[PDB]
Amino acid sequence: KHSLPDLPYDYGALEPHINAQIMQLHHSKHHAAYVNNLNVTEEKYQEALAKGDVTAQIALQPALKFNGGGHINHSIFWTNLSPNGGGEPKGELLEAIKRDFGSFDKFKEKLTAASVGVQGSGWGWLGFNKERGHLQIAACPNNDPLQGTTGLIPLLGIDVWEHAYYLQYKNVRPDYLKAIWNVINWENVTERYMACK
Amino acid sequence: MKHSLPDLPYDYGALEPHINAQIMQLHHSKHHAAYVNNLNVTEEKYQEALAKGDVTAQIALQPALKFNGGGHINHSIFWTNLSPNGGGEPKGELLEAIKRDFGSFDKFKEKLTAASVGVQGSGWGWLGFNKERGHLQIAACPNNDPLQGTTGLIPLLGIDVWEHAYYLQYKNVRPDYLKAIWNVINWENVTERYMACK
Ligand SMILES: [K+]
Ligand SMILES: [K+]
Ligand SMILES: [K+]
Ligand SMILES: [K+]
Ligand SMILES: [K+]
Ligand SMILES: [K+]
Ligand SMILES: [K+]
Ligand SMILES: [K+]
Ligand SMILES: [K+]
Ligand SMILES: [K+]
Ligand SMILES: [K+]
Ligand SMILES: [K+]
Ligand SMILES: [K+]
Ligand SMILES: [Mn+2]
Ligand SMILES: [Mn+2]
Please say whether the beta carbons of A26 and A164 come within 8 A.
Answer: yes
Terminal-to-terminal C-alpha distance of chain B: 30
Measure Cα distances from A34 to A41, A44, B122 in Å. 10, 15, 34
d(CA B198, CA B196): 6
Where does chain B hold its CATH 1.10.287.990 domain(s)? 21-81
**Beta strand pairing status for A122-129 and A134-141?**
antiparallel
Tell me, yes or no, if B4 comes closer than 8 A to chain A by beta carbon.
no
d(CA B70, CA B74): 6
Q: Which of A184, A168, A156 is nearest to A82 (CA)?
A: A184
| Distance from the alpha carbon of residue A146 to the mean position of ligand 3, in angstroms | 15
Q: Which CATH code is given to the segment(s) B92-197?
A: 3.55.40.20
> Bridge partners of B141?
B124
Experiment used for this model? X-ray
**So what CATH class is B21-81?**
mainly alpha
Which of these CATH numbers, 1.20.1260.10, 3.40.50.11540, 1.10.287.990, 3.30.70.100, describes A20-79? 1.10.287.990
Protein residues near ligand 5, an ion, with CB under 5 A: A 66, 69, 142-144
Reduce the DSSP state of residue B109 to 3 states and report it.
helix
Terminal-to-terminal C-alpha distance of chain A: 31
Where does chain A hold its CATH 3.55.40.20 domain(s)? 91-196
Where does chain A hold its CATH 1.10.287.990 domain(s)? 20-79
Please say whether the beta carbons of A34 and A143 come within 8 A.
Answer: yes
Å from A87 to nearest chain B CA? 30
d(CA A81, CA A178): 14
Q: How many helices (H) and strands (E) does chain A have?
A: 11, 3
Sheet of strand A122-129: strand arrangement: A134-141, A122-129, A153-159
Helix (H) or strand (E) holding B123: strand B123-130
d(CA A20, CA A91): 32
Tell me, yes or no, if B40 comes closer than 8 A to chain A by beta carbon.
no
Q: Within 13 Å, how many C-alpha atoms sit on residue A8's CB side? A: 16
| Distance from the alpha carbon of residue B13 to the mean position of ligand 8, in angstroms | 4
d(CA B174, CA B111): 15
Q: Which CATH code is given to the segment(s) A91-196?
A: 3.55.40.20
Q: How many CB pairs under 8 A join A and B?
A: 81
Q: Which of B194, B99, B188 is nearest to B156 (CA)?
A: B194
Of B3, B58, B149, the CB nearest to A68: B58
Reduce the DSSP state of residue B52 to 3 states and report it.
coil
Please say whether the beta carbons of A9 and A17 come within 8 A.
Answer: no
